Symmetry: C4
Subunit: 333 residues, 4 copies
């Protein structure tokens, strides 16, 4: 049995598996992997999988394969390889991808209902912010999934440009990251959740940068607004990266306590080395100005240590901004 090659592969030039020279026909699989461990140019229909309560597919190297239909029955893909595979036009229910590798494969126009991706590798994968639906899905490695995807730009036709494709893919990734995080609120390990928070913050700021770059490329008012937007996105990248690196992205109060103690110790050492204060109260002055409740007792304009005191207060204010949300997260769920 054979079936027509899909327009997603042969016409949609934005797709990772796009091949204008793809064969007109694909073999229709009977889902028998005993004879061939690597299927090629094959269509895997949900109506043709064997009658089983759980189908375990193990160590199969898929290349240039298509999936189609409503996969209601449970499937376990164990250490499978997908290369230029199209999962589009399919609805998987409770499908488990365990240790699988995805290369140049597309998840656009796909529904993954209550599925799981665990210990998977992604490179040059593709998804859609609205047409890659992941209801109750568990992506155990959110950062690798999100940033293992990238827009394919070698088949961009004339009249369209590479840069807009990439910079709109940034927003696409931001949107799907929002969806993935909302999934992970119910589900997954703490580490998976916090990796997802990291990924979604980074993707949101990258999308802001990309949209500002678009507005710049595309009248002087628009150029000024795009430049200001780009600077603003750059600045928010920097601050958010510093804060999340310093507090584990809202996970660990202990790390924030430790950076606070390190900063206080450094300021106290500077007090002791430069202004001849004994350590046992240079530490006290440092923690007194750091937490800002004892600032006015030591700050006097025109004094030698005034700039140092003001810097210590600013460090304390930044540390407050870092530390308060960690406590809020650990105490409010």
């Amino acid at each position: 049995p054979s079936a027509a090659s899909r327009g997603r592969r042969t016409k949609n030039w934005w797709e990772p598996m796009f091949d204008a020279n793809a064969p007109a026909s694909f073999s229709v699989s009977d889902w028998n992997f005993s004879n061939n461990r690597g299927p090629r140019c094959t269509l895997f229909l949900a109506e043709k999988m064997p009658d089983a309560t759980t189908l375990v597919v193990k160590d199969i190297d898929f290349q240039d394969c298509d999936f189609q239909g409503t996969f209601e029955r449970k499937i376990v893909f164990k250490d499978c390889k997908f290369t230029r595979c199209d999962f589009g036009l399919s609805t998987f229910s409770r499908t488990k991808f365990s240790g699988c590798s995805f290369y140049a494969s597309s998840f656009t126009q796909c529904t993954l209902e209550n599925c799981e991706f665990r210990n998977c590798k992604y490179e040059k994968i593709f998804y859609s912010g609205n047409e890659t639906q992941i209801p109750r899905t568990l992506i155990a490695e959110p950062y690798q999934f999100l940033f293992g995807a990238c827009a394919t730009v070698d088949s961009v036709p004339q009249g369209k440009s590479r840069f807009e494709q990439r910079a709109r893919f940034e927003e696409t990734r931001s949107t799907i990251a929002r969806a993935l995080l909302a999934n992970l609120h119910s589900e997954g390990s703490e580490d998976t959740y916090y990796a997802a928070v990291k990924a979604s913050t980074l993707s949101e700021n990258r999308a802001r940068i990309a949209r500002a770059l678009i507005k710049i490329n595309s009248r002087a008012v628009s150029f000024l607004t795009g430049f200001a937007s780009a600077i603003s996105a750059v600045v928010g990248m920097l601050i958010l990266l510093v804060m999340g690196s310093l507090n584990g992205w809202g996970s660990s109060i202990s790390r924030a306590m430790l950076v606070g103690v390190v900063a206080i110790s450094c300021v106290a050492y500077r007090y002791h080395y430069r202004f001849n204060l004994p350590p046992e109260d240079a530490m006290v002055k440092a923690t007194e100005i750091f937490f800002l409740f004892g600032y006015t007792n030591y700050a006097k304009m025109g004094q030698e240590d005034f700039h140092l005191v003001f810097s210590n207060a600013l460090l304390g204010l930044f540390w407050y901004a870092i530390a308060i949300p960690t406590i809020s997260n650990r105490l409010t769920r």
Copy 2:
């Protein structure tokens, strides 16, 4: 085939498509758009759409048309025009409105399950806070959808008044905005979410104003309470508008940092111009009073700069109120 014209069009005077002189009969469509690009006075039944996995409806100008039934099969409306169209008494599942224009069309008594409205224009549309159900719907342009709707008041009968209709539509829009935001928590781009936050805050405050105006119009205790409620809603409009304009409605920490820096710079310039302070520590005094930790070192009642110092402290307090929730939002998801 023909069907009776619906009471929603011929009797419900609150509906946008209400026409007491509407024809008694509507033509029943066979959903063939090859011959006629604009259908008129036509009923589109979900039971009569052609057998297709996805029906693409492109460049069709609907006017005075009704939809009815359970549209389970996927429909894509591409650049269609709906004028005085009734979507009521229908349940659409995974319907995509792409680039469509809605004029004087009603979404009351409608269910939109997992639907999408993208790049759409709305004007004089109508919806219901409880009978326009949008489960998992994605409205890509929340502000335009919400504020493109307005109560129809030309057919209000005697004994009812225009003002109450409009001012209860304000609360209606607030309720549906709440629903739309709850949808967008799972879904959509960051920009769509933040536009929805803007729209729902504005709609909530407009509904408060409208209900206060009703309580005024409808005994001296009630008038006093309505007037106080109206002033309170006005005041909350003003503060919420200022704060959300100043922080991107809880989106961008960088903008709040920039307004803080601008305010500090202005106060420091005033210090330098008026009280002869060098810039390199007029800036320091300004940031010292702005963040409030160095207020008492410079504030003295009866001094020339005392009012300026007090204003700088008040500006800093407002800036704290502006900036803290932005950090909370960017660090807590």
Copy 3:
């Protein structure tokens, strides 16, 4: 046709409609209300309602009636009266109660899927924290629904006591209020949501008081712990009531601003009347100590106004605790 009277009515002495002398048989309704506007001792089965897409039941006075089955078809109850009615053993889907009155009626062992109660009156109704399921339900008047319910205690058998029944009903109401609030996050008007917040806070604290009273009634260590728990619940009742009355239960920043301004004005008037300070800077001292950033400039132990200054600072601290969550709610959704 006739059916056996249910054990919920004749045996379950905790139910509001409990009647040990109830007739052995109930008439089985054919759902024809044209002849009789008030049905009595009648069983309304979901399998026997007439074939209709939406059944409108208007101005029907139900008394001692039972409902049973899966009411999949839409029902609209318009201005109906339910007296000692059992909705138990039923699953209603998209049922609308509009302007209905419930007296001594039970919602235990009932599922209300996507239902709506609007403009309804409740008195002596009954529900269960776990067996009254309200998935996606909209209760437009949460406070009246929750506090219109109360445990029936006249049929408590020997060996059980009235007090435990009532004080465990307090926890029951708290649990169902939690469920109702979680519903209203997606849905309903702002006013309904904030009334639900009020109701659920009050119910949680009443349940704490009731459980402490139980632990007291039911060894000296247990009595001490119950007494301490009761005092703690009393104290949290008081503070939560004051804060929510002062800020609209987290709704309106303007009201909190206004109580802040009133308190500052009162303290400033006291300054001006007692310590001879001109108003134009008694106001400034009051706002300087209220926001706590200028406290140490005016506070000196042993001074005449020291107690007043300390009170002004305490008022400011309480006002901070009142006002910060209102800003958080209005800026973070």
Copy 4:
């Protein structure tokens, strides 16, 4: 009728009921408990339960029993005992476990849709973070369920180690606790929710400790990083335990107020005893330094009470960190 013993019992050595010497065959139950109150080595299929709207199973002592299938019909287990029972390969819908005891029983590969566990005892139970699905489940005793589970280690084969099994079970419990909390947001009593918050915080920190211990056991850079991670997890355990014990894990503002008042009173008593300050303003100095707004009026480096004042300020700062989230929780839902 008889059926083959499942590989979960005879092969999966990580399961609590694992018995390599289990009989090859299990009796297939007809679900008649009138004759035998304790079934042994019996398979309970969902297809073979008697035709009933609600099946009440009361006072049945199950031992070495298996459940299998889609239990769509409602089941009430009342005071039943499960010993080495496998609920795996089953999907229960609206199953109520009331007063049941679970010993060495497994919930892996199980779906519990809208189920309820009330007044149950758990010891040596087993579950999976991803394969124990609890959609809309209500676990009335979250702490006992979560910490009544533990990895079975006596059947660990050669080449695998006990320690890794236990320390990965810690993360497993953390993940399922996250799921249980997300369930309890919609549902259950306040006490159940707050017990779940306690359990999930403790489990998250235990999992952090366990993963750090793994990274230590499994090059000097990795050892240093594991040791630092272990110290960080220890520290966060300590702080989170202190804060949640001091504020009821975000439940009760009154308890936080009371610890604040106790600390202030202790510091004031120390002032009065050591530095001869009258009580009526030793209390005022204590509350003035505790809330930090009056710190600089009393703090002077080199004074006798300077260390005490600094300690009082630190106590106040910790109390702020304790108390603010309680107010946030009680005012923001």
